[PDB]
Design a protein around this ligand. Sequence first.
Ligand SMILES: COc1cc(-c2cnc(N)c(-c3ccc(C(=O)O)c(C)c3)n2)cc(OC)c1OC
Ligand SMILES: [Cl-]
Ligand SMILES: [Cl-]
Ligand SMILES: [Cl-]
Ligand SMILES: [Cl-]
Length: 244
Amino acid sequence: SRAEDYEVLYTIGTYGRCQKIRRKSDGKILVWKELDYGSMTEAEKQMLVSEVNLLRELKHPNIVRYYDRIIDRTNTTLYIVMEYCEGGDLASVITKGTKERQYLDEEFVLRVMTQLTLALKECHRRSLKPANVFLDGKQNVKLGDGTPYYMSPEQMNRNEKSDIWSLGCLLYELCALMPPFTAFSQKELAGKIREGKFRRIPYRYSDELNEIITRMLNLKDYHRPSVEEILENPLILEHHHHHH
Ligand SMILES: COc1cc(-c2cnc(N)c(-c3ccc(C(=O)O)c(C)c3)n2)cc(OC)c1OC
Ligand SMILES: [Cl-]
Ligand SMILES: [Cl-]
Ligand SMILES: [Cl-]
Ligand SMILES: [Cl-]
């Protein structure tokens, strides 16, 4: 459980620095996240430890798996070691789709829907944006922890159905390659969100898919489908789920 056990291959992104690493013992490819607590108080660090201990708990195929936590008092740096998702995040996929003018396959959208819904179902039992949704090597979707496009109508006033809205917005952006509600100001955005109006996703996508995404974007949280009601949907099949 020491930083010297791992070899840094290259930096992925710059919480702090994120790096792709290889464990020397077996050569397993992973990544870690650097948190410089050097400028933190004993209070902030107290929350930092107990928060990462609760990160250690979540073991689920559709949630990014956390393996280890390495402290280095030398540079006062904390390393959270997690699984490597070779496919990157959904943000890049969406960006890649915009540029190349290609819409994502409906099969892919169903995969994200199914696996992110199972991610939420898991998070709710323990009681959301493209850049926090990752893809591994085997078509698996994994969840991982400034205009608020995905903010629900009630989340600007007053709920698990709020997550369904956020998922609704994410899936919509996967289909249309843009968020359901766009605006240059947060007050404009707020305006559009309360009106609850948006375009249909591209017509290459079936009415069935459009229907469910639309239901998730319902203004009444109680009209939105529950995690259960989503998975009962005839669209969602076994091959849309995770596979090792
Ligand atoms: C942001 O862009 C990318 C991210 C990744 C990647 C792979 N595995 C990971 N575990 C993560 C990652 C990094 C940080 C965090 C976080 O807790 O903040 C998470 C949840 C995942 N990212 C891989 C990438 O390679 C394709 C990539 O594209 C350059
Ligand atoms: Cl396009
Ligand atoms: Cl398609
Ligand atoms: Cl309406
Ligand atoms: Cl359209």
